[PDB]
Amino acid sequence: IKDMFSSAMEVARFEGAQIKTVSGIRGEIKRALSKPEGHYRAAFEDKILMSDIVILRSW
Amino acid sequence: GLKVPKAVQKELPFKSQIHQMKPQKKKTYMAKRAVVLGGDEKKARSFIQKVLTISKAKDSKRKEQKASQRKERLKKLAKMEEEKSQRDKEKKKEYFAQN
Amino acid sequence: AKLVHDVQKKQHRERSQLTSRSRYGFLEKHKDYVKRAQDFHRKQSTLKVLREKAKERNPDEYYHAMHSRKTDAKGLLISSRHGDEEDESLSMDQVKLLK
Amino acid sequence: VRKLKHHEQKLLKKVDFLEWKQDQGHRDTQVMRTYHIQNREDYHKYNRICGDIRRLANKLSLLPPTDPFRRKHEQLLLDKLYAMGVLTTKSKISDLENKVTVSAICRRRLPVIMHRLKMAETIQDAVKFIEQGHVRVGPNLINDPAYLVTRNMEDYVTWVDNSKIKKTLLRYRNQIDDFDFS
Amino acid sequence: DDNMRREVQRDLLLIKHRAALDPKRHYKKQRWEVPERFAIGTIIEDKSEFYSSRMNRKERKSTILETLMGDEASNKYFKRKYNEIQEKSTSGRKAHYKKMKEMRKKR
Amino acid sequence: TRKFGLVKRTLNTKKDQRLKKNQENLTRNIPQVSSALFFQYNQAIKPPYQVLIDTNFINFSIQKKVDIVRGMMDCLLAKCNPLITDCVMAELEKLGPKYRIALKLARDPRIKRLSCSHKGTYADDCLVHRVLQHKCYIVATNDAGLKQRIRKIPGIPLMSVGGHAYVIEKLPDVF
Amino acid sequence: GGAKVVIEPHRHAGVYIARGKEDLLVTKNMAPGESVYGEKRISVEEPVPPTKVEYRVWNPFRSKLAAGIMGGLDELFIAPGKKVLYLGAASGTSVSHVSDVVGPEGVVYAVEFSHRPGRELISMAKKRPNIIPIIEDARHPQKYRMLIGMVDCVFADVAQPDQARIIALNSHMFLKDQGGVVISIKANCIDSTVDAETVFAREVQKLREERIKPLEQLTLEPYERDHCIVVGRYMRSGLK
Amino acid sequence: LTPKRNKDNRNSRVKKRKKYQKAQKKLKSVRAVYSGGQSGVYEGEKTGIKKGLTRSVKFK
RNA sequence: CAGCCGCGGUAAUUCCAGCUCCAAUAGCGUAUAUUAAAGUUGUUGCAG
Ligand SMILES: [Zn+2]
């Protein structure tokens, strides 16, 4: 997942959070990728598409 | 479509064999021989095709609309039958409670 | 609608794909995802059924139709694309008459 | 015999040339048309076996529930009837009157397990093949259809080699090796 | 014979699919498979009344198909209905899929 | 050069037509709803009405002391023709010598009488058949089962002894 | 008007359906080459060369029997080898269609009482030889008991209030046992003080009182208001 | 806060004019209604002829 | 289960066109009490 964070520190702050696509596919962020900074690895209920947007509902 | 793998489909039973016929790459003699008629016959062919697809799409529209009709008739019919069965199982308990 | 207002059961409209993210056309929503997912699941179900039949082939399986039906080099099934009431190769006097 | 008239249906009703009382609904005829038994009297030489096991299961029920002779012989009978595959499990001794059937002791015959594991495609063609002498259980050929099998030998029901229908199915799947002579 | 069924085999299709020839006619639901014995016949309108049911000498034809092909309002309706059935049937199948892929690829 | 899998030929109880249970070797019919009917109105019946009586209606008439033709007339406020079918009459005669009063009140020249043509004396079957054939009949009855049959078939008015006079239900022009 | 139809046999033997875009009830023509009351015709070329045989359109608004056929009657008794006694053969309108349904090997006795319809009946029965025109009152079957013997179906298109007596007399004289009795009842011409269902119920009761078991009735409503066809068979012993 | 209501409900007479027109259009579906006889030339049945269906009331 | 609550937005929005249908109609709901209908018994229902 590309750009909801600006740094791996930010993703480290937000690890384990539950996200979802706009299709309601639930998911969880797992680990920040190393070289592209705000990019991370998430796991979903099944295969999401390239035309989706993930969402971290915070308050 | 369902693309069953070759490693699976070579090891299938005899009944479960998948009849998949290959396309033809050679201009065979019967196909290069066979005559098609033109003008009035090709517009007759075009007309019969248009008529048959309009008939088939009209039938598919009609049966889809009947499916949408009868699922909601099933819904209201099941609601009325549930209300009826509730009334029966309380009237039976009334009858036996009096007798 | 027993105690509901018609200004309360309004129509919430659905949102489109962002114009920056527009080359991946049509942001898909939950009805599109369930149309995707149940298609994938029925195709995986029939693939799993065919894999189980391949595991339980029982290679001492004789039919009488495995005299006529035959198998190509890779092991798959040859399905003759012409007929099965005709013959693909026609005789010399038939070719004489057609020519 | 003449589809009798009405004063005829009434005057004699118990007349029936086709089906008598002691036919028991022709269950012998029906089950041998089902499982395609060649000669007669196989049904009744199975029915004697069914009657004998329900009779000795009755007198094993008669003996008191504490002696090891009784309990060893009923577990031995239950294990032997499992070992010849008449049953499908080692359950209650009530299944020795509910579940032993002349049907199931015909189910353990050689053509019907052949149709069961799809070696043939009908029981008639199975009896065709094993009268023509193509199959074997382990090493030895089987000629008669009266050879029923045990629970161990539903794995080595296979044709013989040089059986040409085995050769036709091998050349169907074009896995036809011929160093192994079939 | 089959030699004559191969001549009247098209207007029997028209009579089988009567229900989608005119958009206002709406027959009662039968199936009408091809009957085993039939006969193709031509209507004699007599020489008593004129001009009402009279199809003239200059427009009498030899099948039902030539009359339906000569009808120009039916040709309008069949072409229009066929184009809308066509563009409904090719709505999202393969040209759409590869133009979506080219949309992804172009940038 | 014999055949293989040779069997003894026996008879096939599934197939042989010489025995009795194997002696069992299209045009639809959807009867149109009557042109006498609107949706459930029965727009065609008009006075003088004609009313089919049955046995418990006669018994309840005598038990409640209502005259047949005068009770019908002040129930419907119209001129009535009451009809005893031969099966209703057969049922009243079969009721025995306890019901002599009811039988010789059904024997009345003011009560006309039909001629049913069937076997048996089942008046409920006869009344139901001849009313769902024709829809020009009022059914006067007090059987609960016959009342349910008649009020389930549409366009048929039903009369019944209730209280001390006759009542009528499915006739929509009573006042 | 010059179009082409396909002829197809009906369920009823001897009558046909011509399918086009409007389908027509159709009979074969016993006298080919002319129309009798101005109906339209269909000429097929059936296969010495093929011969042009032709067919006549049966108009349900000018024939109670055709209205009954195409409303749907389970059994007509007018059949292709039979004898029909037509009562009230008011002209040659329906008698021609009954005649060529019955065919060349069967006989239609067309009974009519008026005389100018009788003249047209005789001039039609010239070109249809299987019609015996009988100019006589049907209320006295003895006046023509010498000309007719043992019919198979009676058809009654009389429009008189003593209809059931006429039908009963002609059936008891000339109909055979388990033969056909087809009645066209007109409610307004029987009596108009009662409703149509009352007069149909009374006429059916009169038929079974004269021992003709009714099998079937049909209202034939889109073509005629307050008409009916009652199809029965002459049971003669045991309606039960 | 009322629901959306009907212009045909705003007049008690026009509502029964338009639910009787609906009723006598439904009556053509259940029965076969005598429309008035033959209008012009007899064109044909215009809707089909079923040779299998018999819509006649059998007795008992 | 439900849903006037959605990212923005209130001069903003133009939206299942204001969702569809039904019945009565200058009338139309709700709560409570009720009247009528017959299955009206042939005995024994407690701790007397
Ligand atoms: Zn009766």
Q: How many helices (H) and strands (E) does chain A have?
A: 1, 4
Residue F124 near residue G189, CB atoms below 8 Å: no
Residue D105 near residue D148, CB atoms below 8 Å: yes
Mutation site, G6, G16, G17, G55, interface E, largest E CB count within 10 A: G6
Q: F43-60: b or e for each residue (b if 16 or more CB lie within 10 Å)?
A: ebbeeebbbbbbbbbbbb
H53:G72 CB<8 A: yes
- The backbone torsions φ and ψ at residue A2, rounded to the nearest 5 degrees and listed phi first, read -85, -70
Q: Decide the pairing of beta strands F158-162 and F138-140.
A: parallel
Helix (H, G, I), strand (E, B) or coil at F80: strand
Question: Encoding tokens for residue G26?
Answer: 């159709």
**CA neighbor of G151 nearest in space, from G183, G182, G175:** G175
Residue D106 near residue D30, CB atoms below 8 Å: no
Question: Encoding tokens for residue G144?
Answer: 């023509």
A23:C30 CB<8 A: yes
In whole angstroms, give the CA distance from residue G234 to residue G211.
Answer: 7
For C30, the closest chain A residue by CA position comes to A23
> Which residues numbered 21-60 in chain C sit less than 7 A from strand I, measured from CB?
none
In whole angstroms, give the CA distance from residue G218 to residue G227.
Answer: 9
- CB-count exposure of residue D99 (10 Å: 0-12, 13-18, 19+): middle
Query: How many angstroms is it from F21 CA to the middle of ligand 1?
Result: 35
Distance in Å, residue F175 CA to nucleotide I25 C1': 23
CA distances from C34 to A24, A25, C31, C37, C79 (A): 10, 10, 5, 5, 36
Residue F51 near residue F85, CB atoms below 8 Å: no
Question: Encoding tokens for residue F28?
Answer: 């639809």
Residue D97 near residue D109, CB atoms below 8 Å: no
Query: How many angstroms is it from F80 CA to the middle of ligand 1?
Result: 20
**CA neighbor of D148 nearest in space, from D85, D95, D63:** D85
Q: Decide the pairing of beta strands D140-141 and E39-44.
A: unpaired
Q: Decide the pairing of beta strands F112-113 and F80-84.
A: parallel
* Cβ-based neighbours of G157, under 8 Å, separated by 6 or more: G64, G65, G86, G87, G88, G89, G90, G94, G184
Question: Encoding tokens for residue B66?
Answer: 């009947």
Question: Encoding tokens for residue G207?
Answer: 């038929």
Which of the other chains make 3 or more beta carbon contacts under 8 angstroms with chain F?
Answer: D, G, H
Helix (H, G, I), strand (E, B) or coil at F20: helix
B11:C57 CB<8 A: yes
Query: How many angstroms is it from H28 CA to the middle of ligand 1?
Result: 35
Residue with tokens 């009434």: D10
Question: Encoding tokens for residue G133?
Answer: 């025109």
CA angle G153, G157, G162 (to 5 degrees): 100
H50:E30 CB<8 A: yes
B8:C76 CB<8 A: no
Q: B30-51: b or e for each residue (b if 16 or more CB lie within 10 Å)?
A: eeeeeeeeeeeeeebeebbebb
| Cβ of residue H38 lies below 7 Å from strand I | no
**CA neighbor of G168 nearest in space, from G206, G210, G128, G204:** G210
In whole angstroms, give the CA distance from residue A2 to residue F27.
Answer: 71
CA distances from C46 to B1, B3, C35 (A): 12, 10, 17
In whole angstroms, give the CA distance from residue F96 to residue C41.
Answer: 75
Asked if the C-beta of H41 comes within 8 angstroms of chain C's C-beta atoms, the answer is no
Residues with CB under 5 A from ligand 1 (ion): F 85, 87, 116, 126
**CA neighbor of D126 nearest in space, from D140, D155, D147:** D147
Residue with tokens 């065709």: D128
Q: Do chains B and E touch (3 or more CB pairs under 8 A)?
A: yes
Residue G166: DSSP 8-state = H
Helix (H, G, I), strand (E, B) or coil at G222: coil
Residue E19: DSSP 8-state = G
In whole angstroms, give the CA distance from residue B15 to residue D36.
Answer: 24
Residue B79 near residue B73, CB atoms below 8 Å: no
Query: How many angstroms is it from A38 CA to the middle of ligand 1?
Result: 94
- CB-count exposure of residue G2 (10 Å: 0-12, 13-18, 19+): middle
DSSP string computed for chain H:
-PPP--TTTT-HHHHHHHHHHHHHHHHHHHS----SS--SS----SS---SS-B--EE--
Q: Give a three-class secondary structure readout of chain D.
A: CCCCCHHHHHHCCCCCCCCCCCCCCCHHHHHHHHHCCCCCCHHHHHHHHHHHHHHHHHHHHHCCCCCHHHHHHHHHHHHHHHHCCCCCCCCCCCHHHHCCCHHHHHHCEHHHHHHHCCCCCCHHHHHHHHHCCCEEECCEECCCCCCECCCCCCCCEEECCCCHHHHHHHHHCCCCCCCCCC
Asked if the C-beta of H32 comes within 8 angstroms of chain F's C-beta atoms, the answer is yes
Out of E18, E28, E52, closest to residue H50 by CB: E28
- Return the sign of the alpha-carbon dihedral for residues B52, B55, B57, B63: negative
In whole angstroms, give the CA distance from residue E88 to residue F52.
Answer: 62
Nearest CA distance, F62 vs chain H (angstrom): 31
CA angle C54, C59, C63 (to 5 degrees): 100
- Return the sign of the alpha-carbon dihedral for residues G73, G75, G81, G83: negative
Question: Encoding tokens for residue F116?
Answer: 């049913």
For F118, the closest chain H residue by CA position comes to H60
Task: Find how far residue B32's CA is from the centre of its chain.
Answer: 36
CA distances from F8 to D39, F5, F11, F13, F72 (A): 7, 10, 10, 15, 78
* Cβ-based neighbours of D145, under 8 Å, separated by 6 or more: D37, D38, D109, D110, D111, D126, D127, D130, D131
For H48, the closest chain G residue by CA position comes to G23
Query: How many angstroms is it from F118 CA to the middle of ligand 1?
Result: 7
In whole angstroms, give the CA distance from residue B56 to residue E83.
Answer: 14
Residue F31: DSSP 8-state = P
Cα dihedral F60, F66, F72, F77, rounded to 10, equals: -140
In whole angstroms, give the CA distance from residue B60 to residue B54.
Answer: 10
Nucleotide nearest to H2 (CA to C1'): I18
Mutation site, E40, E50, E62, interface G, largest G CB count within 10 A: E40
